[PDB]
């Protein structure tokens, strides 16, 4: 199970934050600072996985953007590292040449993509072809 999914930049400005368990705001906050203090200090010579409190973080950088996924420790690292990736690959289809800005000025629909490919802590859709097919049938909606 995925505890949460973060998308912050090199400065730690959160730009997407789907949480999958009940947290206070004061928790959600310290929680984000920490995911920063941890993922930002690692230098490629290290690995894409980190112990993080009782869970662990799968993460990959893309431009100025860190894509973090927090998961149960007994979770499949390579699986979630490619989930993360093909998620980005769906954003770059929807937005076309997606970048930090599309994700900001469109924060409200970033969420409808996330929830299409992840739900209730677990993976939901994996097929890029179908998720584009629906994202594009909405958007045609009033």
């Amino acid at each position: 199970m995925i505890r949460f999914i973060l998308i912050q930049n090199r400065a730690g400005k959160t730009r997407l934050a789907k949480w999958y368990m009940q947290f206070d705001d004061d928790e959600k906050q310290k929680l984000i600072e920490e995911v920063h203090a941890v993922v930002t200090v690692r230098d490629a010579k290290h690995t894409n996985f980190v112990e993080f409190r009782n869970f662990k973080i799968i993460y990959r950088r893309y431009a100025g953007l860190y894509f973090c996924i927090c998961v149960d420790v007994n979770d499949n690292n390579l699986a979630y590292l490619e989930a993360i990736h093909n998620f980005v690959e769906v954003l770059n289809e929807y937005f076309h040449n997606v970048c930090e800005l599309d994700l900001v000025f469109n924060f409200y629909k970033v969420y409808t993509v996330v929830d299409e490919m992840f739900l209730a802590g677990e993976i939901r859709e994996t097929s890029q072809t179908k998720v584009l097919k629906q994202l594009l049938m909405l958007q045609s909606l009033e």
């Binding site: 893309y62 431009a63 770059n92 040449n97 997606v98 970048c99 930090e100």
Partner: peptide
């Protein structure tokens, strides 16, 4: 830090 750089390609 120039937030307009592509995430891919």
């Amino acid at each position: 830090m120039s937030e307009i750089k592509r995430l891919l390609s």
